[PDB]
């Protein structure tokens, strides 16, 4: 169907990107009306002569306001369809988003909405700031369905890689652990043994934080099923600290 209709569509789509973000000042008519066009266009996975025509490099709406419930996720899926692993973070865009994680209602539903677009980047200094915005959105929720969905993507995005900022975010779990032992972030506290083991290889203040983390692990050991589940991984956090040391 798409294979036909885009060949049909060389005739009249109706400077189109010239006035693309024009009437945001000006009744959501043309904005949503072309949002439909771009979302429909972004539906194409030899026959990939199309891809140039699929790419007629239109990247203004990416950093349009990087409504904003509606349009930006459509741009997300279109860019994911038609269009290195660490280049894309200049497109924050999550700079309004993960920083806007407490604006008290289009916002309140874009909140639980854009968790899909937050998982979607599962596909060298400012990544610490990206993990900062991510932690701000995280503890802003730590909407729980797609939040628990994004909880899985957060750890793999954390171990996705500078790498000094990656070890910084690996002990960011210990940074938030000062309020731990909550039950929400207990799964992240359990899985943080993997982040410490990820820091453990080339990485083995910091050892002082490791001693404070072992002290917090012993304090969680006497803090007394989900906590009883995460306590076995807090022993794995102590072992990974052994392999490592060889609303703010």
């Amino acid at each position: 169907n798409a294979n036909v209709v885009v060949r049909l569509l060389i005739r009249r789509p109706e400077g189109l990107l010239a006035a693309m973000e024009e009437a945001i000042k000006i009744g959501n008519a043309i904005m949503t009306f072309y949002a439909a066009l771009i979302d429909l266009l972004g539906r194409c996975a030899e026959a990939i002569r199309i891809r140039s025509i699929l790419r007629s490099g239109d990247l203004v709406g990416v950093i349009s306001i990087a409504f904003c419930p509606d349009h930006k996720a459509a741009m997300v899926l279109f860019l994911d369809r038609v269009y290195v692993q660490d280049f894309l973070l200049h497109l924050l865009g999550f700079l309004p988003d993960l920083r806007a994680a407490a604006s008290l209602t289009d916002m309140a539903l874009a909140l639980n909405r854009y968790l899909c677009t937050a998982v979607l980047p599962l596909l060298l200094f400012a990544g610490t700031e990206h993990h900062a915005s991510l932690i701000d959105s995280l503890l802003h929720t730590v909407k729980g369905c797609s939040l628990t969905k994004a909880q899985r993507d957060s750890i793999e995005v954390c171990l996705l890689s500078r790498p000094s900022m990656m070890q910084h975010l690996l002990r960011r779990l210990v940074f938030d652990v000062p309020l731990l032992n909550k039950m929400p972030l207990k799964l992240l506290t359990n899985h943080y043994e993997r982040c410490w083991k990820y820091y453990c290889l080339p990485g083995g203040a910091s050892e002082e934080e490791l001693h404070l983390s072992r002290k917090l692990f012993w304090g969680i050991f006497d803090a007394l099923y989900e906590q009883e589940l995460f306590k076995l991984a807090l022993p794995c956090l102590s072992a990974v600290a052994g392999a490592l040391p060889p609303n703010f």
Partner: protein
């Protein structure tokens, strides 16, 4: 009546700029530029345009199913493929080459106009193995059909394969887009045309005497005189005269006694535009009129009309006694009295006016057109530096 492979036509529209019937054919540069361009052939009796820069030969028409054989190829595309003549059907992908420079017609991945989002431009590559060079045929005629035989004198939409964009004509631009242009197909020479050593239209040749002719050397009168000589002037470039008839279609037919003769120097590009008062003058297409360029051929000093085909292979080259007569004057080319003896159009003068000929070959003409275009670039760029 119809078209096969190895067939030479052109592509024209009499397109409009404010109700113009502007007989614009697509002409390609080659040998120094990879872009093509429009070419008005309307006032060809007073600005005769070039044809050798806009003639093309049907290299290979094939089925669309046959193209994926080349996809399965990773040679010589089965060296025929098939026959034979492979008589033209609509709904075929075709290979097309320039005649002269011989570049193969392809589109471009470029946007060298408006913008106008991602439509495409027209190129001339030499890698035929790429479907920018491949071109699916569509008659824009429900009165006709697709798959049936392609006649002479039809009108078509030719669409790409890679871009699959139609042949777009823009304003004056030629491009590939989601809109189309109809295309006349004027038959020129087919095929074969017909035998070795014959007066066949479009030819460039030498004008021998038994002895030959000459143009002066360089260092410029801009060679605007014409004489006789022995010498290696055949071996020189200056003895080269691209014949053109007034007939736009079938211009590469056989030449016969007294066809209309738009005659043109090659190294300059100037036409032999006869000063009608006394003798010979040289200027470009602007002077080239029925008073200035158009002559006839007569087998005797005392002594063509209608052919939609190859015609009669009239004269060979060495066996040629052609009393050239200018139509506008009735004069005949005799001489005066370094053997650089000046020839003159005259009533009689001398009785040696049925002169002798010898055709050229491709490489030498090619280098000649190169030289012409070369100095055309060169001297204008020289004053580019001077500015």
């Amino acid at each position: 009546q119809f078209l096969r492979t190895d067939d030479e036509v052109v592509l024209q529209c009499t397109a409009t700029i404010h109700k113009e019937q502007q007989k614009l054919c697509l002409a390609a540069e080659g040998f120094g530029n990879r872009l093509c361009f429009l070419e008005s052939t309307s006032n060809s009796k007073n600005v005769p345009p070039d044809l050798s820069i806009c003639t093309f030969v049907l290299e290979q028409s094939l089925s669309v199913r046959a193209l994926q054989e080349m996809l399965a190829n990773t040679f010589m595309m089965k060296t025929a493929q098939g026959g034979g003549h492979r008589t033209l059907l609509y709904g075929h992908a075709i290979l097309l080459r320039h005649s002269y420079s011989g570049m193969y017609l392809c589109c471009l991945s470029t946007s060298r106009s408006s913008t106008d989002k991602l439509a495409f431009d027209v190129g001339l590559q030499e890698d035929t193995t790429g479907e920018a060079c491949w071109w699916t045929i569509h008659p824009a005629s429900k009165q006709r059909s697709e798959g049936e035989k392609v006649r002479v004198g039809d009108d078509l939409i030719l669409v790409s394969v890679s871009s699959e964009r139609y042949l777009h004509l823009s304003y004056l631009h030629v491009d590939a887009a989601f809109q189309q242009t109809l295309w006349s197909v004027a038959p020129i020479s087919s095929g074969s045309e017909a035998a070795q050593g014959y007066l066949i239209g479009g030819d460039v040749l030498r004008l021998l005497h038994g002895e030959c002719l000459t143009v002066p050397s360089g260092e410029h009168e801009q060679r605007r005189t014409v004489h006789y000589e022995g010498g290696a002037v055949s071996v020189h470039a200056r003895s080269l005269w691209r014949l053109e008839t007034l007939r736009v279609a079938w211009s590469g037919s056989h030449i016969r006694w007294g066809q209309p003769f738009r005659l043109r120097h090659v190294t300059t590009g100037k036409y032999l535009s006869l000063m009608e008062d006394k003798s010979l003058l040289l200027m470009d297409k602007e002077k080239a009129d029925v008073k200035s360029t158009a002559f006839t051929f007569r087998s005797s000093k005392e002594k063509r009309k209608e052919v939609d085909g190859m015609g009669t292979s009239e004269i060979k080259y060495g066996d040629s006694v052609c009393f050239i007569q200018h139509i506008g004057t009735g004069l005949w080319l005799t001489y005066q009295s370094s053997i650089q003896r000046k020839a003159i159009m005259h009533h009689e003068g001398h009785m040696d006016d049925g002169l002798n000929l010898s055709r050229s070959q491709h490489e030498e003409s090619r280098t000649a057109r190169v030289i012409r275009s070369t100095v055309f670039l060169f001297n204008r760029f020289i004053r580019g530096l001077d500015a």
